[PDB]
Amino acid sequence: IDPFEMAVKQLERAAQYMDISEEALEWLKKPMRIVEVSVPIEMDDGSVKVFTGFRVQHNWARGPTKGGIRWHPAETLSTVKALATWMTWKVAVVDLPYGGGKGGIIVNPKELSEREQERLARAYIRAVYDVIGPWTDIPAPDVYTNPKIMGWMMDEYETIMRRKGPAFGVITGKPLSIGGSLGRGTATAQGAIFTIREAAKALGIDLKGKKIAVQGYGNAGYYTAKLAKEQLGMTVVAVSDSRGGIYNPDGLDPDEVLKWKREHGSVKDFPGATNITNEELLELEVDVLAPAAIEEVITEKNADNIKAKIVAEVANGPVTPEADDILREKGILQIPDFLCNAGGVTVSYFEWVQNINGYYWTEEEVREKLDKKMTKAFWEVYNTHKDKNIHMRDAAYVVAVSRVYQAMKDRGWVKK
Ligand SMILES: NC(=O)C1=CN([C@@H]2O[C@H](COP(=O)(O)OP(=O)(O)OC[C@H]3O[C@@H](n4cnc5c(N)ncnc54)[C@H](OP(=O)(O)O)[C@@H]3O)[C@@H](O)[C@H]2O)C=CC1
Ligand SMILES: O=C(O)CCC(=O)C(=O)O
The missing domain is CATH 3.40.50.10860 (Leucine Dehydrogenase, chain A, domain 1)
Incomplete structure (x- = not known):
């Protein structure tokens, strides 16, 4: 399947939910x-x-x-x-x-x-x-x-x-x-954590003492689990890697899990935790699920069995559209992939701003600005979600394409 046609069909599906001229759609269907x-x-x-x-x-x-x-x-x-x-x-x-x-x-x-x-x-x-x-x-x-x-x-x-x-x-x-910038290493996880907190606020549930399961234990997965445990106060009950996964209802310490992964080569056989599979981790009853691993982990086969209230797509497209439909019908709030992991590009934007200005910020300033950006973006997406009565992914696509279309119209590139 051509990766270009796929993106084009994605753009056309997004345009189906919004009022956009045919000339603008044709312009957006081709790289400039x-x-x-x-x-x-x-x-x-x-x-x-x-x-x-x-x-x-x-x-x-x-x-x-x-x-x-x-x-x-x-x-x-x-x-x-x-x-x-x-x-x-x-x-x-x-x-x-x-x-x-x-x-x-x-x-x-x-x-x-x-x-x-x-x-x-x-x-x-x-x-x-x-x-x-x-x-x-x-x-x-x-x-x-x-x-x-x-x-x-x-x-x-x-x-x-x-x-x-x-x-x-x-x-x-x-x-x-x-010309480097602080906060680059944990940008994606920090943005995902901010989006998770805003989603919890939108659903009216506090995350203090709640359960979070993270799939994939790389840089994104480990930092997501950590930042959740400290900032959000959530109980990391399950983590996994390509090799395998582990579960513990009493909670896990991300630092110890990373140490054991870096020592034995995998997160398997952690003390006090039973070894499980990636699919078992996906279907675990939690409040927040954060797949931070290979794509297409949530599909039509297992979408109906998911019990998490919040699914944060830290990775790139871990949910198939039929699974989006199933989860939305189930009442599970989804954070779109290119909205949840937007912290890295935001932090990148911050680095570019620092380089352009010649003045560099501290970790606290970068964190605070990232918090503002992620909170505003998530609330805009969620407001579009509720107003248009469409999927969260659809709302994010609508917001992005609307912004690009408005910019194109303001420049005079498209007259309609
Ligand atoms: N890299 C980045 O900067 C950002 C990444 N993303 C997206 O996020 C995801 C993760 O990013 P990243 O931290 O770089 O990934 P990493 O390459 O750093 O690590 C991959 C992790 O996922 C695990 N993994 C790979 N395949 C599977 C599998 N089939 N099942 C279960 N676990 C698996 C790996 O396990 P193991 O330890 O055994 O190898 C490892 O824990 C990617 O999909 C990426 O596209 C987007 C935001 C920015
Ligand atoms: O960080 C950037 O500027 C682009 C990197 C990227 O492709 C991404 O974050 O998905």
Whole structure:
């Protein structure tokens, strides 16, 4: 299934719930600029290898485009286009002055040296310099890409630009020593926690002493469980990893679980906790369920058996549309995927603002601003949810597309 057509059909379904002109829909169905470049690097053996690089700028009506760079051997142009289109709505739903962008290189970085990786980053910057900038396109870390590559890319951009502007702001996710921002590591989990708290407030239930189950125990899952336990005061009763999962009705300590995961390679066989399966964790009777793992964990097969009141989609699309219908009929409030995990891009926006201004904030200021942004975005989505009597995902899509459409109309791009 083409990832581009899928995004287009998603956009058409969103447009079905709102009044949008056909010309605007056709404009939004096509990326405004796609750049495909050859990335030649010198290998350690002395030969010269050429890679394929992409940089798709879907739409920049609201401002400079934003999006990460992927280094995956299976990366395709359609994937970049779909992810840029997705990023447009992600930055629109949280009200950032940003557009949609995405980049990628068809490369297997598992078999590249550090010097070869640096050469790849610098050559990619040299290839795509003409379409990126602090006010044109801001790349970001993504799968198989880390802040080290961001530092290399920023250095190359600064070298090419001859320091004629804010070279720090050309890219986000940089190391703290060079234009980095505080709060980047726990951005996604913090945004998810804020959305969960706002959802609980909307449903009129307090989270003090409640039960939360988290699927996937990576950076997002671990920090979600932790931040829940401290800030929200909830009782983490179950966590899981690809290998397996564990359950304990008396609660779990996220630090100890992470220590055991980092020692034995998995969260399995934790003391005082019985080993369970991922599906058993999904169907556990809790108050908040936060899948932070591979996608399509909630489908038509198991959607009816879910007992959680709040499902926070920390990961990317862990629920299939039939499962959305089943859960909405069940009365379970869902937080849309690109609204729950919008903390990372918000924190990225904050880093760009700090770089542009030349003044850097503390952890408390970043946390407070992220709280405001997430609270406002969630309440807007929930108000659309109740007013239009549609699904939460549908409301988030309506809000994002409405913002982009208004920006497009104000510029005069579309006359209707
Ligand atoms: N990476 C980011 O910055 C952000 C990520 N997201 C989305 O969130 C999710 C998680 O992000 P991230 O923290 O980077 O993930 P990680 O790569 O850091 O870790 C993956 C975690 O999920 C587990 N996992 C992988 N497959 C399964 C599975 N089939 N069943 C159960 N657990 C599984 C892994 O287990 P194990 O420890 O055994 O490997 C691990 O615990 C992704 O879907 C991602 O797209 C969006 C927000 C930003
Ligand atoms: O953080 C960014 O600017 C983009 C990264 C991304 O693609 C995401 O957060 O989903």
